[PDB]
Amino acid sequence: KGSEQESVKEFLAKAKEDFLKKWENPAQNTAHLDQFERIKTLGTGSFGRVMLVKHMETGNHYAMKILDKQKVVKLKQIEHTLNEKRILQAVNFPFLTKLEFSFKDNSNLYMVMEYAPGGEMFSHLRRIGRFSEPHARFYAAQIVLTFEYLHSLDLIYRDLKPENLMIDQQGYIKVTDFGFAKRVKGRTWTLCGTPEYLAPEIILSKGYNKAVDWWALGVLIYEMAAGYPPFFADQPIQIYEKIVSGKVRFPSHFSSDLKDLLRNLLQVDLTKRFGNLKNGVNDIKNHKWFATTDWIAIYQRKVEAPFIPKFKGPGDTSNFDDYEEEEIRVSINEKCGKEFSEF
């Protein structure tokens, strides 16, 4: 289509048509583990890990998330895991990695996605210390666009943080980690996310909506620009007490416009929180701090990234930490058939 052919509204309307087709009729069982060569573990977690793999028939590199069915069950993440796969196989956006393949075997669930060789934003943010406002703004813009997309599909994302933002070969980002994402038109109630990034209404055990994502954006922008988050302590409980008060202090190097944006994102009052008002996302996109961002150019990936990863070949993993490599064991007996029937 032409670059000015459609409004954002029209573009998002057509994107929803595309999404709903796939949402209503999900792809299932589209590869097998023996089609991939396992190269390296890129991350680990409580019920899963992510590996760099090579698809043998194409030589393409992918990230493959491997979930142990029994562990997903023990941790009560069955419905959340079904959500993740159903959503990721249906989405399509420049800053998301949709599923290229998914499948399961007796023991595990597998989701295969475009590989992001730049590593986690977390790694770079901690090492460098903090990002300049233009640098933080460039990342933030991509999240604003991605949330507008996600939210227009009635999706809530619910785990924004630097650990869950992957940097690609051109220095743009991928919003990964859809484990808590959910398609919901009403309010919802699950206590989930990461302590530092939780909106007060989640902590106060209120029903909540997509406004929690916009609060989390405020937390991210603060952390990217300051080098530490707005609410931290050694223990989660102390972090929660800080959030519910919502008292924040800005570094003296923060610009006036940054502070003002953050005051409107980190707003405890839902009737005042940017992203949650009559005008929706446009209150964010039209804020003075974003006055210089070319939303159209960012979407088209036309803007030169402020930081472009070191890249020494298509399956390079130098931007990742090293993790202990564990076997992928497949039982001879089918585990959790019923629970993951639709996967």
């Binding site: 409580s46 941790l75 009560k76 993440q77 977390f122 901690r126 210390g129 785990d159 943080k161 650990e163 484990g179 808590f180 699950t190 206590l191 989930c192 996310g193 990461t194 302590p195 530092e196 300051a226 080098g227 530490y228 931290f232 302590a233 050694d234 989660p236 202090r249 570094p251």
Partner: peptide
Amino acid sequence: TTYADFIASGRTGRRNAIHD
């Protein structure tokens, strides 16, 4: 400094999600 207090904290590494 706030930076120093952060770096001395136990939450500068990768943060785990929470779950009810």
